[PDB]
């Protein structure tokens, strides 16, 4: 007699993978997921934020459901979305997940975090959506820039041993991936537009002002603290004390909402910038700079 | 294909609202409830603390469903109870929430404790009843007095997100008034009382004994610590280092017991006092005053 | 209308009971629940811990779900499995828990972890099952011995409330003892071999190798610390510093499932080690020795 629960988690273990870490004096464990059929796996950046950055002492390989341990290959990463792509050479009849649309995704919506069954402690936990579009800080694991996404919030508890795991509806659909930098989930239609940028290019473009913001409420928004010189924040005409109060057509509540909406806008298109300056209400324009421009 | 929890939370949606208390340097922010279709809105005493003991400088405004921000007046609040009632003016055609009956919720009833939609962290938890009749203590948030409530407790968290929002059961009817002062609400049937109190008073009167008690366990009830001069507790006979184990009739196993115990009580009544005196079981009598005698 | 869970919650409610050890000058409660109809109460060590450490000082007591007050009397306690074993006298009409079999649980599969509802801050929760043989470390209550059990991990909340009562499927059979020393329980399979021994012995046997073991992760196992003068280990060849990654049939991935693993062997027969000594990959073969010769 089959639970409603137990039925969905079944069928998604199989697309879920352990993907490993390990150094001559370390290890580090996490859960990922199979989206392409050609090998393509996706988990957080922070699970193999070491070893990406120290590529000569570190080893990654993938355990799957059936304990077959393959080498994994790192085909891309982003600190920003806290994503990371990995891909398994010439490996059959592989279970792809059914990725879903995160658009659709509704407040009540119960789901499941599951995490890679052959883990150390890997778990699988039940819960509702508790919020849509909830930007959220993350920390950075190593030399890794902290960063701030717009998240699906649920009540589900993510944890080390569902990081990087799918979050997962009751259609056995991806609707997000876990990431447990009270649980926090990239929205799988944002997932799809990285994974796709780091599968061809091997790495992602972001929009950049060159701006830091402090939160601010009263009678609220992003206090700008430090412009650096030649950013297209100063060429805009945007000075320090102002307060960001919409980028773009997104309004903005503080900092972490500051920096999801500078990520929305469109590099090299100008885009209008709200700001109150000294009382009153101004609205500058700004161009927006590649993070990378080498890659653009 | 609207799943359970989601159309229940959607239903109750536009009777919960945003509750907003600025100044030049400070802001503040809850969920509150519909209860009144001339506009009484009810949410916890915290969420409102500050701009109550500092009118002269907050300023509290209502945020509905629709986006619509509408100015807010202060009818009453019991920090006793942690409870306030606010009212908009000239407001058409609001959703009233369907107020439930508290004594006929059961443990493992399934619920919702549901935030306004329009909050900054606004959050939708889901869980289970745990335990009827659980005396909470609370922090007092700025002068006011720290207090203990016979809460509904919950699995569902009670975060800043969802505190002053209703507790749902699975008609959509409000059971309780979420507070996150692991979850705790205040029972519907009390708020029922109080907000009443408040409405018609803009006030409210609790019993008061003069008695400051500490918990005790060995071979069970509340230390007397302090009795007041001219306290009925001192006209009743009560000494201090006395444990009392019975108030009305109500057994009391510890400090928090007592506070509730005591609440229940009539005012100008005489009510029974059993104590444990240096090993006598000793029965006293004591007749309790207002707390606020010129309100009452 | 009750609700999946009440209907459940209350079916159990008369097999879970308080359990009380109080002395002068202290109290202590937890759950247990009633496995045999001649009077038999299963709990965790740690509930009675002080009370059979100091049996002069200390009275137990089991409250019943109809207020009911007995004297109990302990059978035996296995500090290693955090189980204990008390027993009532005389009482007629007892309802005895319906027992499972946790080899039949899954991942996924709901779950209530009950606490006894005459407790003073007793706590019903709900969740899933979100792994299974999870070896988990517990801290020992007085002068009791840390132990690592091979937990059934659960996302219900356990906590003080509902400590030492039954965790629960969905047809109202126990699947397992909850341990709040994020939930944890003891599997029933496991405790009803437990409480064999303890109803008929007063005690129980456990295997002992004479290692102390700490956890290594590298390119994994249990390190070995200490190895004490005429154990089984040294007996066997075990030198210091070696890597235990296999002890009998089951891989070992740190000190936590070493522990675990060591339990699952046989008194007095020979049984392989697999240890990574220097870089070599050695078996060597030892005998387990009782941990309590004369009990055995």
Same mark, same amino acid.
């Given at each position: 007699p089959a639970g409603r629960f137990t039925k969905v988690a079944a069928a998604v273990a199989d697309s879920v993978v352990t993907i490993e870490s390990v150094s001559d004096q370390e290890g580090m464990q996490g859960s990922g997921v199979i989206v392409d059929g050609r090998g393509y796996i996706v988990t957080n950046n922070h699970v193999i934020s070491e /070893? /990406?950055?120290?590529?000569?002492?570190?080893?990654?390989?993938?355990?799957?459901?059936?304990?077959?341990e393959v080498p994994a290959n790192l085909v891309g990463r982003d600190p920003k979305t806290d994503?990371?792509?990995?891909?398994?050479?010439?490996?059959?009849?592989?279970?792809?997940?059914?990725?879903?649309?995160?658009?659709?995704?509704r407040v009540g919506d119960e789901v499941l975090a599951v995490g890679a069954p052959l883990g150390l402690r890997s778990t699988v936990t039940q819960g509702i959506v508790s919020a849509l579009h909830? &930007?959220? &800080?993350?920390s950075g694991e190593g030399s890794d820039t902290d960063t701030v996404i717009d998240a %699906?919030?649920?009540?589900?508890? %993510?944890?080390?041993?569902?990081?990087?795991g799918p979050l997962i509806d009751m259609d056995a659909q991806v609707i997000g991936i876990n990431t447990a930098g009270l649980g926090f989930a990239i929205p799988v239609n944002e997932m799809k537009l990285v994974a796709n940028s780091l599968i061809k290019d091997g790495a992602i473009v972001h929009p950049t002002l060159g701006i830091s913001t402090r939160s601010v409420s009263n /009678?609220?928004?992003?206090?700008?603290?430090?412009?650096?010189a030649g950013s297209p924040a100063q060429k805009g005409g945007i000075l320090e004390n102002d307060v960001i109060v919409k980028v773009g057509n997104r309004?903005?509540?503080?900092s972490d909402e500051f920096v999801v909406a500078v990520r929305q806008l469109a590099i090299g298109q100008d885009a209008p %910038?709200?700001?109150?300056?000294?009382?009153?209400?101004?609205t500058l324009t700004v161009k927006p700079? &590649?993070?990378?421009?080498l890659e653009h």
């Amino acid at each position: 007699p089959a639970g409603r629960f137990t039925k969905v988690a079944a069928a998604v273990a199989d697309s879920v993978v352990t993907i490993e870490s390990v150094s001559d004096q370390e290890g580090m464990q996490g859960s990922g997921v199979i989206v392409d059929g050609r090998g393509y796996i996706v988990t957080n950046n922070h699970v193999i934020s070491e /070893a /990406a950055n120290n590529p000569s002492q570190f080893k990654t390989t993938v355990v799957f459901n059936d304990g077959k341990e393959v080498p994994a290959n790192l085909v891309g990463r982003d600190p920003k979305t806290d994503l990371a792509v990995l891909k398994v050479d010439n490996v059959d009849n592989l279970t792809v997940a059914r990725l879903g649309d995160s658009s659709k995704v509704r407040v009540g919506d119960e789901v499941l975090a599951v995490g890679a069954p052959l883990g150390l402690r890997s778990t699988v936990t039940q819960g509702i959506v508790s919020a849509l579009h909830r &930007p959220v &800080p993350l920390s950075g694991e190593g030399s890794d820039t902290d960063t701030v996404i717009d998240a %699906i919030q649920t009540d589900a508890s %993510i944890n080390h041993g569902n990081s990087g795991g799918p979050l997962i509806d009751m259609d056995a659909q991806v609707i997000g991936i876990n990431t447990a930098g009270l649980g926090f989930a990239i929205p799988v239609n944002e997932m799809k537009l990285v994974a796709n940028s780091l599968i061809k290019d091997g790495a992602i473009v972001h929009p950049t002002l060159g701006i830091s913001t402090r939160s601010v409420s009263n /009678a609220s928004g992003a206090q700008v603290a430090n412009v650096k010189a030649g950013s297209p924040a100063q060429k805009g005409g945007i000075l320090e004390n102002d307060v960001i109060v919409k980028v773009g057509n997104r309004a903005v509540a503080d900092s972490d909402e500051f920096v999801v909406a500078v990520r929305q806008l469109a590099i090299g298109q100008d885009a209008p %910038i709200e700001v109150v300056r000294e009382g009153r209400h101004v609205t500058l324009t700004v161009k927006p700079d &590649p993070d990378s421009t080498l890659e653009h």
